[PDB]
Structure formats: structure tokens, C-alpha cells
Design a protein around this ligand. Structure first.
Ligand SMILES: Nc1ncnc2c1ncn2[C@@H]1O[C@H](COP(=O)(O)OP(=O)(O)OP(=O)(O)O)[C@@H](O)[C@H]1O
Ligand SMILES: [Mg+2]
Ligand SMILES: [Zn+2]
Lengths: 165, 614
DNA sequence: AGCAGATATCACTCAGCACGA
DNA sequence: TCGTGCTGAGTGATATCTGCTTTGGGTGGGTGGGTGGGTTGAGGCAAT
């Protein structure tokens, strides 16, 4: 399925349950962006500059605040580091949020349509063609923004070292 | 008079022969230049001189027979535009005519020039023509029946090539009654066996036997070709086409090589079964290839010597090795010394002393360590890239497998064996099988791999250096604990590396700022990679340094001093062999045949810095 | 249905003689 | 020693009839082989 995802995002579900062989395959996909086959039958190497979307569950099934974030994550720390952005989503009980969620789900079940009426969703076709246009586009950066990014990097490095203490 | 015509057309063979002879006899590249709208690039010597006459003369001088023809040159000449169109439409007959005409002109050159070259040798040769550049290249998916028996161009990647297949040319028959022999030619693969003995006196019918080993054969090979990645419209499985190559073109392209092939699109019936003349409706398509293309000198030695004479050669090589890596001078120097390597000693009475150098790259994951391995691979003339516990890689040890293609037992050599005489880079040393660790220990101890499985008892040479990388157990390397605990490797295996480098990403404002500046700018001369590889190859092939008395004294004094530092043992005898190897490698780098005090001083310093980390 | 082995009935070559030239 | 039949049985030859067997799959077997194909699923075993 990775080949079909070449030059495109990969939608992987149950990421933690994946076997170690596929873990090594995705590791090769990320670090090298290449797919290599070494078999007697055939030997073909196909380039794979494909992004990955991963969904996983904690080690215990649910996140444990007592344990450190690394402990809750079964995957190797190197794989987590290689990920550009990691989003942690949790379900915290609350009267207001639960009530709104229940109302939304009930309305969806009854009327078979989006309950929200404050705003009208944009047409999917427009969104996808806009995304294609943006992909076709090429930006550029200056030296001042480079210096700003350098300053942000040193600040973030100091903050992250202090946090990792 | 008998008038010879190509079947199904109205083209006279005599006209084609005379046109091709005239084209070959008189043709200049200036015609091609004017045709290509490059008339203003015309010079006065090469473009005004006969081209194919010179080609034929050079071919006679070198003794070769095959001639490469550019089809566009036919269009560049007024007479042969019809010949070019015919070649595009009727390739087989035109090619045969071209071959015969080439032989005719080759003999006529000697006849007219009354040269001293032997004619009998020429008369007994076979000549061929290999046209190329016959138009835009089509795709494997655009080949319709209309293109059958026509000349096509196809670009793709080679996937496999069968062994050489003997193809019959002339059949040799023997009489069972009179011991009389006769050779009968083969047409369309049909042997024209005589009905009876050709001898008047011996007219014995039906007594002719075919002697298989006394017949004339040719070379044939079948190759599978896959369309290039850009030809795939959506991303489905790329299609493939079968190619056939005969004679010189055999073994002209290995697996995994991207090639461009010119040939004839042919269709052949397939028999339903082996018992009968019955044929399948559907025909199989393939390409009869006629041309295949793949897509140290005195001056080089002078340049190498000039570079060696440069004072700042060490720094220049260190910079050229890793231009994109910032502030790792010591690691780059160690890598350079490993690449050049030490002197291999073949001792009588002593055995074998290895001249290789092993370096371990361990430290924090943030720092650049895999890029260094990739650079080393790009530089080393011989080597393989591998990661421990990696299915994609071929493997680190030799193994016995089954050839799926052929259903045959084959002994396949591992990555370490294939790296004999080079540098083997192992990306992920931390995670590795026990078996693989034992194989690595054996390779780094005995330098040979032994396998006694599948009824095979053999030993394979593995005289290769190792440049491995490692990561700590946790998210970072803890300075408080010793290196052995952090790297998570056996003390024995960790004590065999000559140089151990601990590149640590300590949080320092200055270092972080400089690294950020370097990285953002990525968005002292440097040597090209090719020249560096050539220099390394020449140094490893020719120069062999030898230790001198001053080097002996310096080495002894340095070892004694290092031992006296520490009861704690600061250094062992291994730290002396490592110094000897490093000094020999440094002497190799300067293209010196004698190890001097400077090399020993450099060696003690590189060895000491790693020990200080330890 | 196609293929390989076999039977038997189909001609053709060298054989040679009578007449006469 | 040429020409023209008549005789002729021998030496062919070619136009002409009599019996397999096959595909592939257990409606030929395991004293035809497993390197001529089939062949994915369950089961037991040793190294791990
Ligand atoms: N001195 C340096 N100069 C340039 N880039 C550097 C340097 N040190 C670190 N980097 C950057 O650090 C990153 C390290 O990537 P690399 O592939 O080498 O990681 P690695 O050592 O294999 O990591 P891991 O142990 O997590 O697998 C690269 O982006 C490299 O640009
Ligand atoms: Mg790495
Ligand atoms: Zn004979």
C-alpha cells in the first residue's frame, strides 16, 4: 500500500499494533524515502517520497498521567523524534463538553445532517483544487526571517532542555 | 535480367545497395550540422572530413566489426532519405543489405588503397550495423499491432537476464556408411537434412546423422525490461517487455541498469502443446534488439601528485569528505584515515596482520551520524550500506538460498563479504541478532566467514573495514554512566574498534546558534567526490608505507607513556596496533612510502582524544 | 483431430532380344 | 552399330490405411518423479 502512497500522504490506522517488519519499512520510508526489494524472484527499487499519518493508542490503552509521555508510547523514541508534529488527544470529562458532544451526535443521528448552522462548510471540490494550487506554488524566505527562526530555535532549545531536566 | 525486389514492396535492392555505398563513401558531419540548424558551429577540419570512411579505417585498425550508425545522418544526406524511411518500415532486409554493403566497402578500401593488410582475415569476418536514434521513444503501453515488424526505440530498467543460450547457425551431418561429412545451412530454424548421401559412389538413402558438438552456434539471451517510473500514468504496476540480444550485445547490460534499446517489434506464434503443430490465436510480442545504450591517465597522475604536494592536504581532504557536516573535524580526520587504511602484512612464520581501521560513531541521536555513513559510502570505492536487524538489506553473513528463477541451490555472499577491501557501513549497530553479533566478532577477529551448512564447507574472505553507528538506550546519552552502559553493547565487541567517537549534543548557546546559522544558510576549497574517490583508489592500490627507526622509537615511547599514566590500566597492546595502523594510514594519505615522526605524532593524538572520551 | 508406423498396389529403370540398316 | 517396340521382373516410391494419446486432474496411479506443473491450511516439531 506504500507504493500507492508514493508522493502522497499515507493513512495508517492502528499504528502501534503494526508488526516490527512494517515498522522497519516505514523507517526506511522516512529516513531514506526509498522502497527496496531484495529477492531472488525480482530486485526492484522504487522511490517513495510519501508522508505518513499515524494513529496509535497508549501502552495501557489509555494515557496514564502518572507515567511519563515516553513510557505511555510503545514506539521507539527515534521514530517519535523523526515525526515533525505529534498531536496528543485526550478525553477529559466535563459537563459542558459532554452535553455539546451528545447534542451533536443525537442531531446527526436524527436529521442525517450537520447540526451546526452558524457557518456554511466550503465545498470539497473548491478545497481540493485550492490545495492543488497551493502545492503547485513555491515560496521563498529571506535572511531576516532566517535570523528570526534561529532566535526562535535557540529559545526553544533552552526551554526544551529546561523541561527535559 | 533477374531483378531482386523486397517482398511486398517495389523497392529495388540494387538501388538501396548503391545508395548506401554512396552515402558511406562520401559523407561529412557538416551535413548533419546544417540539418540540425547548427550550421554556425561548423569548424573547418572535423566537419569537412569524411566521417564513416574514418570510422571504417579505425575499425580495420582495431580489428572490430560492428559499426554504429546514426539514423539522422541518413536524413542529413539527400540520397538516403528514402533509405531511412525504408529502414524505419522494412528493417530486416535493409539491415542485411547494410551489412553486406559494409563488408563490400571494407574490402574495397583495401583493394583500392593496395594496403599491406591481409585480405583473407577480412574475408572471413562477419560485419554488422547498429542503428540508433530512429525517432521519439514510445511507451510499452503504446505498442499496437500496427507497429509489428517495424523499428522502435524503448527506454526502461533491466530486471533480469537469462544465461547465454546457444543458437544454431550451421548443421553438421555425417554419413553412417562412408564417413562423409557435409554442412547444411539453417533457414527459419529448419534443418535441411539431406535425403541421401551427396556422394555418387555412396548413394545410401536415409543414413545421415547430426553431430551436435561439431555444429556452429550463436549467442542468445532474453532480457526483461520495465518501463521507466515517469511512464506510469497513475501508479499501477509498471508493464514489462521481453528483449532478445544476439552476439556482441549479449552481456551488454546487467540487472538494475537503465538502458535504451533499438530493435524490431516482432510477434511469434506459441504452440498449444508440445505434440502438435497447433498454434494459439494470441501472439506474443518481443523486441529484436540491434543497439543498446546505457543512460587513470598521465594527466590524472600529475594532478594527484600536485594535490599531494600541497601543504594543507590533510585539512583539504577532511573538508572535502563532509562539506555539509559542521564542526566535526576529528571525526572527519578519523574517517579519512580509515578510508585510506593501513598496510596489509602477509607474514611467513607470523600469520596475517590486518591493516584495516574500525570506527564506532556513537552519541546523541540529534547529531548527524547517518549522513556521515552515506558520505563514506559515496566516497569509498567498495562498500555496502546495512542496518542491523534489517530485512531490506541483503544481510551481513553468507547464507545458502534457493534460486526461485531457476529452482537451483546458490551460495549467496553477505554484505561483509561483498565489502572485501572496502568500508562496510552499518547504520544501526544497537539492534542486532546474536548470530549477527557472533558473525561480526568472527569477521573482526579472523577476517573470514566460515559456513558449514547445506553440505557445503567453505570459507569466504571478508577483509573489510567497519564503520558502525550506535545510539543510547534512552532519549540521550548520560555522561555520568560509562560509555559501555550507554551504548548497550558487549564490552568485548566494543573493545575491538580502533577509534571510538562520542559525538554528544550538549546544550550550549554558542554551539546551538552556530548550528542554526549553518543549517539556515544551507537553504577553503573543496574537492569533487569523483576525484577524491580516484585519489583514494590510487593511494590504496600503489603506495605501501614502511615503519622506520624514528617511528619505532616514537611509538615505543608513546606507548610507554600512555601505560605509565595509570591499579587502572590506561592502555593495552591493542592501543599500540591501532596507533601503528593509524600512522601507516596517515603515511598513505601523503603518498609516502616511509612512516615518519609526524605520522606517529598525529596517530598518538587521534588515539588519545578517543581514549579521553573513554 | 492429429501424428507416426505400416501395408500393398502403383510405376519406372536397366535389361536384352528380333528385324534392317 | 541406331531405332523401335515387345518382355520383364526387379527395384523401387509414393499414394494410401491402422492404432495411439493427448488435456491436465485424481472418473490413469505412488514399483513414472518432486528440479514438468498444482499449493493454500492445518498440523507437529525443533530451536528459540
Ligand atoms: N554538525 C551538523 N551539521 C549539519 N547538520 C547537522 C549537524 N548535526 C546534526 N545535524 C542535523 O541533524 C539531523 C540528523 O539526521 P541523521 O539522519 O544524521 O540522524 P541520525 O544520527 O541517524 O539519528 P537517530 O539516532 O535519531 O536515528 C540532520 O538534519 C542533520 O542535518
Ligand atoms: Mg542513523
Ligand atoms: Zn555416404
Amino acid at each position: 500500500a506504500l507504493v500507492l502512497a508514493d508522493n502522497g500522504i499515507c493513512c495508517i490506522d492502528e499504528f502501534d499494533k503494526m508488526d516490527e517488519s512494517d515498522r522497519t519499512a516505514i523507517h526506511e520510508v522516512m529516513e531514506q524515502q526509498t522502497i527496496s526489494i531484495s529477492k531472488a524472484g525480482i530486485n526492484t527499487t522504487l522511490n517513495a517520497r510519501t508522508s505518513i499519518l499515524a494513529a496509535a493508542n497508549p501502552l495501557y490503552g489509555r494515557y496514564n498521567p502518572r507515567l511519563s509521555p515516553l513510557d505511555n508510547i510503545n514506539l521507539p523514541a527515534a521514530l517519535l523524534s523523526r515525526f515533525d508534529i505529534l498531536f496528543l488527544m485526550l478525553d477529559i470529562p466535563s459537563r459542558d463538553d459532554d452535553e455539546k458532544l451528545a447534542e451533536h451526535v443525537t442531531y446527526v443521528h436524527m436529521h442525517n445532517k450537520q447540526p451546526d448552522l452558524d457557518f456554511t462548510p466550503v465545498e470539497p471540490s473548491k478545497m481540493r483544487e485550492y490545495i492543488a494550487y497551493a502545492k503547485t506554488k513555491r515560496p521563498v524566505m529571506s535572511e531576516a526571517v532566517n535570523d528570526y527562526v534561529v532566535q526562535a530555535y535557540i529559545r526553544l532549545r533552552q526551554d526544551s532542555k529546561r523541561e527535559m531536566d | 535480367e533477374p531483378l531482386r525486389i523486397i517482398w511486398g514492396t517495389n523497392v529495388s535492392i540494387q538501388e538501396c545497395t548503391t545508395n548506401f555505398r554512396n552515402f558511406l563513401m562520401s559523407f561529412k558531419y557538416k551535413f548533419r550540422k546544417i540539418l540540425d540548424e547548427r550550421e554556425e558551429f561548423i569548424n573547418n577540419t572535423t566537419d569537412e572530413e569524411l566521417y564513416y570512411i574514418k570510422q571504417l579505417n579505425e575499425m580495420r585498425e582495431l580489428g572490430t566489426s560492428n559499426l554504429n550508425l546514426d539514423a539522422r545522418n541518413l536524413l542529413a544526406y539527400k540520397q538516403t532519405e528514402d533509405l531511412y524511411h525504408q529502414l524505419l518500415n522494412y528493417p530486416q532486409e535493409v539491415i542485411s543489405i547494410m551489412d553486406q554493403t559494409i563488408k563490400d566497402c571494407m574490402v574495397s578500401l583495401i583493394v583500392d588503397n593496395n594496403l599491406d593488410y591481409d585480405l583473407d582475415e577480412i574475408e572471413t569476418k562477419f560485419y554488422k550495423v547498429r542503428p540508433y536514434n530512429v525517432g521519439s521513444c514510445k511507451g510499452m503501453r503504446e505498442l499496437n499491432p500496427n507497429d509489428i515488424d517495424k523499428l522502435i526505440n524503448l527506454k526502461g530498467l533491466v530486471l533480469r537476464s537469462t544465461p547465454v543460450i546457444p543458437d544454431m547457425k550451421v548443421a553438421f551431418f555425417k554419413c553412417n556408411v562412408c564417413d562423409h561429412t557435409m554442412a547444411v545451412e539453417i533457414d527459419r530454424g529448419v534443418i535441411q537434412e539431406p535425403a541421401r548421401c551427396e556422394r555418387i559412389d555412396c548413394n545410401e538413402p536415409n543414413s545421415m546423422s547430426l553431430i551436435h558438438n561439431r555444429c556452429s552456434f550463436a549467442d542468445k539471451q532474453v532480457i526483461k525490461l520495465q518501463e521507466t517510473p515517469d511512464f506510469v500514468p497513475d501508479g499501477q504496476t509498471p508493464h514489462s517487455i521481453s528483449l532478445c540480444v544476439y552476439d556482441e550485445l549479449v552481456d551488454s547490460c546487467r540487472a538494475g541498469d537503465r538502458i535504451e534499446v533499438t530493435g524490431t517489434f516482432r510477434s511469434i506464434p506459441i504452440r498449444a502443446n508440445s505434440r502438435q503443430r497447433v498454434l494459439k490465436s494470441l501472439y506474443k510480442t518481443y523486441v529484436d534488439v540491434v543497439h543498446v545504450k546505457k543512460v587513470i591517465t598521465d594527466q590524472d597522475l600529475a594532478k594527484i601528485r600536485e594535490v599531494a604536494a600541497r601543504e594543507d592536504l590533510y585539512s583539504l581532504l577532511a573538508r572535502s569528505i563532509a562539506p555539509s557536516i559542521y564542526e566535526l573535524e576529528d571525526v572527519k580526520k578519523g574517517i579519512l584515515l580509515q578510508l585510506f587504511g593501513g598496510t596489509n602484512k602477509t607474514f611467513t612464520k607470523g600469520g596475517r596482520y590486518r591493516g584495516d581501521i574500525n570506527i564506532l560513531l556513537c552519541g546523541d541521536p540529534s547529531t548527524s551520524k547517518s549522513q556521515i555513513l552515506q558520505y563514506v559510502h559515496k566516497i569509498t570505492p567498495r562498500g555496502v550500506y546495512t542496518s542491523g536487524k534489517g530485512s531490506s538489506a541483503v544481510g551481513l553473513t553468507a547464507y545458502i538460498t534457493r534460486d526461485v528463477d531457476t529452482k537451483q541451490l546458490v551460495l549467496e555472499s553477505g554484505a561483509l563479504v561483498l565489502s572485501d577491501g572496502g568500508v562496510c557501513c552499518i547504520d544501526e549497530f544497537d539492534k542486532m541478532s546474536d548470530s549477527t553479533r557472533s558473525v561480526l566478532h568472527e569477521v573482526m577477529e579472523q577476517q573470514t566467514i566460515s559456513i558449514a551448512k547445506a553440505g557445503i564447507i567453505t570459507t569466504l574472505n571478508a577483509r573489510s573495514s567497519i564503520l558502525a553507528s550506535a545510539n543510547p538506550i534512552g532519549s540521550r546519552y548520560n555522561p555520568n554512566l560509562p560509555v559501555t552502559e550507554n551504548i548497550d553493547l558487549p564490552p568485548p565487541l566494543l573493545s575491538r574498534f580502533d577509534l571510538v567517537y562520542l559525538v554528544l549534543d550538549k546544550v550550549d548557546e554558542k554551539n546551538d546558534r552556530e548550528l542554526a546559522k549553518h543549517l539556515t544558510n544551507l537553504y577553503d576549497d573543496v574537492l569533487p567526490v569523483e576525484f577524491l574517490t580516484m585519489y583514494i583508489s590510487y593511494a590504496k592500490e600503489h603506495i605501501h608505507p614502511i615503519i622506520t627507526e624514528a617511528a619505532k622509537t616514537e611509538l615505543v615511547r608513546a606507548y610507554v607513556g600512555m601505560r605509565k599514566m595509570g591499579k587502572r590500566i590506561t592502555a593495552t597492546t591493542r592501543q599500540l596496533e591501532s596507533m601503528i595502523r593509524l600512522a601507516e594510514a596517515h603515511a598513505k594519505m601523503k603518498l609516502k612510502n616511509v612512516v615518519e615522526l609526524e605520522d606517529v605524532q598525529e596517530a598518538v593524538r587521534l588515539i588519545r582524544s578517543a581514549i579521553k572520551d573513554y
